[PDB]
Amino acid sequence: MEWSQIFHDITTKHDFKAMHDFLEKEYSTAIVYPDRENIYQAFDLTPFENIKVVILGQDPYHGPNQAHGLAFSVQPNAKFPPSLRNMYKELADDIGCVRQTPHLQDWAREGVLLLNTVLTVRQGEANSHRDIGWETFTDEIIKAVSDYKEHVVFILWGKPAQQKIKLIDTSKHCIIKSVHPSPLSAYRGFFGSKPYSKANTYLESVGKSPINWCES
Amino acid sequence: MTLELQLKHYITNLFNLPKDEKWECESIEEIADDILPDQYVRLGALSNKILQTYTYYSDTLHESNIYPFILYYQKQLIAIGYIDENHDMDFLYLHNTIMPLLDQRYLLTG
């Protein structure tokens, strides 16, 4: 089963013409991230058949040379966002390995779908593309993953991501959830939560090979 | 002058940071109950409210171990401050959607 088939289903069930018209005008008259050709990079790097873990983000980074179409990841030479710094600290305490690149294309190749719930943002304006149709799209994507895959780990950080629990069949799938890794919340249950090894233990229980989370 | 920039002038002067170092910003939504001290999270006020969160970062900010932050609930400003080196939140401003609780915004006059 392929993304192109799923996207066709979604774009038939909902009419996204007004979203595309709004985005066309946004990319012409404003500074929108990520670069247009990167909007679907999470789908390009993690084919549907390859998904083993889904990690939900929120909006793309809204500063220059940060976002590139993956949840949490920034471009290889960009500085570490606070949440990613915390994710890597937990990674070092949980799995043992140390990452120094802030780029997550390797995780995506391993089968980690790094899906933001909203896929575009205007520069410096948090939430500026909330409710233009991305949530409809991306809710449908989560459903599709749940419906058509046999056994996936969904990793749900923060309350907004946890609102997607109702779209995920937990008789089929593994939910791992905690407070958000942001330094604003991370001490209320992100540190020590071991999402990476928990994900891998579940994958092995179901006869799948673990994610290599180390630099690869 | 924007709030972000007032906050930047205040922090860079207070911590003796380079003035032309770029501050990047991460925006994350999270429930108030997981962000703020318990005494400031109360039923009918901030409890169960999703905040829009702005946390600023740079290399000298990481070296000082601080995180300047600004918090909103929709269009209402909720907090301005910074998480300090002990990982405690240090407020210049705090509002609980009912009344202002802390207000040293005069510190941001530049």
From Swiss-Prot, chain A:
This protein's record includes keyword Transmembrane: no
Primary location group: cytoplasm
Pfam families cross-referenced by the UniProt entry: UDG (PF03167)
Record's subcellular location: Cytoplasm
GO terms, molecular function: uracil DNA N-glycosylase activity
Catalytic activity: Hydrolyzes single-stranded DNA or mismatched double-stranded DNA and polynucleotides, releasing free uracil
Translocase recorded as keyword: no
Protein family: Belongs to the uracil-DNA glycosylase (UDG) superfamily. UNG family.
PANTHER family: URACIL-DNA GLYCOSYLASE
Protein name per its UniProtKB record: Uracil-DNA glycosylase
Organism annotation: Staphylococcus aureus (strain MRSA252)
